[PDB]
């Protein structure tokens, strides 16, 4: 009384996330916590800014101000320090750990080193680790070695690496920076939206691209930037300031979600925002 | 223009999952993928039976028969062989890996060894690893050593261990087996429901208890068993046969979820079942 | 304006704890958490019985029944499983970890293996690790290798090992067991009190000896036993049953303390007991 | 005849020490030796100044001058050289080890490297390790890397790291330095008290803050500084000069204790001081 269904042969189910179709199960599994498999996109809440800036505006009290936002994000991005101290583990939300540092606003910005061992990233149950690359800066070379080192250690263990292009802010520059990062082995690339040519940044990059929010904009313009980036091929957005510095952060996030996951237009999204 | 809210002191948020209030963030984060933080409970779909039994009834074709069930479970439990081969990583569901084996139905049941390295559990992004303890059996000693080994390795890396009490099936026996396992350091205990005294099994165990389904019962009796176990303090149920051997598995899961998470009565749950 | 006090030469302060005068700082510091430096003695509350016995009488609920006792003890002894789950780290009391197991009441008693790595002992901030030696039993050989292995690992790390003589219960037997253990390198020995010859067990053993409580006695007889052991040169007592199975455990501990640290007579101690 | 108390469910006891609610048992246990669990505060006696200064005033003879003070402190802070040579292990007091060095008063101050391996901190049974961060200095980068390194190694082992903000001495500067250090993962931060805005330093830092004494003040002014820091949210004080350079060091410590643990006013405390 057993049924092997020998008339229906077993068939592999393809993994579609851009450029991640030849990774081991664990790594694909981690990537699937970050990018929703249905939509292939992500809404990321970043609040790691303190790692070289100290208590920056809006992030003075993560425990009070930012904690109510966690549930509305797909994925959290922050440092192990903030994570252990004030992000309740019961939050049950994927985390990308900031894994570079040792710079500050008082010195050369690009002077970064790896700021956590893979050992501890694993211990914290990260989905990914993140480092800045600074093409064109004084410490460009070290910043790439940082990526190299994370990818080397990450491959032993199934942990994806995210390279973030730290900084002329034009297409040919980001194309350079994103492509080198990808070519060194980063599975995720975070960069900035650009008025013209962003399409080419995405096209020339073989792995998922996520955009950073940049400085605080009026809510409707920020939603336009999201709309454009998504429309032009970005795999998600990672806002900070544009969310945590808004007067209605929860509403903003709902709007961003509509744009990113549900193909909402910039306008409808803004009206969704206004209704909270 | 910064607000530190110095009139409101920072306060730690308690972690309430039974017996897991003193573990590191990463370990508490993995336990929070398994036990829903709101309810403190879990519905787990087990299908590792193949590890010593071969193609058992209902599990001849995981890829066809079981795959549509994944989305309805809180957590999956299986071996690394099934995981890589036929569980699509896009499933985006927590997994507990079977980490013991090297026995079969053709020999002494209790003759198990560790069947995967922690190295690989981490590579697969597990939430926990599971092994059998066989108190009272010929290879009792080795079976405990297996737990000791996994706990040792798991603590280096933030990986919870689940001890499963393999097998007179009464309260004093299970009290013995569960308590030894917990005492040796397992963070989760899986055991069987018992007609009388189950409350004591729960009370005498300092960490979360999940019950196994056992042999196929009529759906309404299975739901009674769940209800009783939950009512008497179990932190979750881990059915296999009672789900994948039912004629309406998806319906049975929804029913089990109502009992486990939503305080439904056995009867209401059965009616919920009947409406699919 | 500096004063080097060149007229008064620096002088080393001797460490007096029996046979521990040639250990490194860290190991001596850990031993000093256990044995009060003023008196050279310890009151230890043991509740690791579960490790091979399951929920034993008095230890069904450590969290309710035993937790109120912690503050009255010098040092706690238990398993890592109990420690992480139900001993609040805020207790701020030195712990000795049970580091052997994989035996049970349903099989050969002496069949023990090392039950925690030194790695995790250090992670838990233990003061010492304990294992049973079973001279005369079936698995005598393995049990001494257990001690050997912990002492080897403990010397790398400054962790003291306590050997426990598990079981004819006479002087010549305990002299054999305690001396072998010490000769292998254990820094602390736990054994049983004996009607006659106990003085010789102490004299023939070059390191501190602590006595186990044994089965429940009437409070006054238990206090006599302590009195005798301390009088005859024991460095402390480690009661379990005689404390946690008493009707007035807190009172019993205060009595035990008076005998052990303050040279109270058996009688006075019993009256001290009666006044709570 | 067993009582499981099935009518009273097990309940986790919360750990309240600011921002240390998600750490493993051993790390919480080490932190509880430092910060009294009742009050959440600490009085720390620091005498590590020798590490880059040689025999500084008051510390010419630790063995004579400082030894009688140990018993009145909650926790000792010094180097491993001092600890092994002249701190008697029988002192039975928690120690925080200075773990940075290789600078001196004859060269650039911020040129520090890690001065002891975690291996040896464990060997010494420390409760924490400490190192200087020098935001804004020439070797700022290396100094952060030192913290990173200690946290990485500390996490493997359950050892908390204390970052000390070495040095314009205003709020916005210490906010930067404390927050970066916390963000990199230090569990304890030691900084200086500031005339204005100290409240904000505390609020913006997600982990415990302890203040350094600074240069010798008249006893009553020193007690005012304590009172203010504690009142504004500091978790403790770590005096050196203000204690060991006073004419009545034991009296001063009792006064500091009254301020720190018992809510004494600056005035009462000074009168308490005067009465020895
Ligand atoms: O160095 C990167 C930034 O500080 C943030 O972590 C993020 O990547 C971009 O900033 P925002 O989210 O505010 O736009
Ligand atoms: O050895 C354990 C079993 O094979 C299953 O993995 C499970 O733990 C219990 O069986 P069932 O879910 O069918 O009740
Ligand atoms: O195997 C040793 C025992 O179980 C206890 O840990 C203790 O060493 C002696 O027992 P009791 O304290 O009850 O006398
Ligand atoms: O570099 C730090 C100092 O030398 C001391 O160790 C301490 O942290 C602060 O100095 P004081 O206790 O004298 O105020």
Author numbering:
A (entry chain G), B (entry chain E), C (entry chain D), D (entry chain H): 10 to 176, 181 to 289
Q: What wording appears in the published article?
A:
To identify the catalytic site of LsrF, we determined the structure of the protein in complex with two P-AI-2 analogues: ribose-5-phosphate (R5P) and ribulose-5-phosphate (5RP). In both structures, the ligand electron density allowed definitive placement of the phosphate group and illustrated the general path of the carbon chain, but was of insufficient quality for unambiguous placement of all ligand atoms. R5P and 5RP bind LsrF in the same location, near the entrance to the (αβ)8-barrel with the phosphate group oriented towards the coils following β7 and β8. The phosphate is located near the positively charged side chain of Arg254 and is positioned to form hydrogen bonds with the side chain of His58, the side chain and main chain of Arg254, and the main chain of three glycine residues: 226, 227, and 253 (in all cases with N or NH groups). The ligand then extends across the center of the (αβ)8-barrel, away from strands 7 and 8, in a largely polar environment. In particular, Lys203 is adjacent to the ligand; this residue has potential significance for the mechanism, as equivalently positioned lysines are responsible for Schiff base formation in other aldolases (below). No large conformational changes were observed upon ligand binding, though there were small movements in a few binding site residues, most notably Asp251 and Met252 (with α-carbons shifting by 0.5–2.0 Å). A single water was built in the binding site of unliganded LsrF; this water is displaced upon ligand binding. The P-AI-2 analogues ribose-5-phosphate and ribulose-5-phosphate bind to LsrF in the same general position that other aldolases bind phosphorylated substrates (e.g. E. coli DERA and FBPA, T. tenax FBPA and M. jannaschii ADH synthase), suggesting that the canonical aldolase active site is conserved in LsrF. Key catalytic residues in these class I aldolases are structurally conserved in LsrF, and both P-AI-2 analogues bind LsrF in the canonical aldolase active site, strongly implicating LsrF as a class I aldolase.
While sequence analysis suggests that LsrF will function as a class I aldolase and genetic data suggests LsrF is involved in P-AI-2 processing, the details of the role LsrF plays in processing P-AI-2 are not known. To begin addressing this question, we have determined the crystal structure of LsrF, alone and in complex with the P-AI-2 analogues ribose-5-phosphate and ribulose-5-phosphate. LsrF crystallizes as a decamer with each monomer having an (αβ)8-barrel fold, a ubiquitous fold commonly seen in proteins catalyzing aldolase reactions. The LsrF oligmer has a disk-like structure, with two rings of five monomers stacked on top of each other giving rise to a decamer with D5 symmetry.
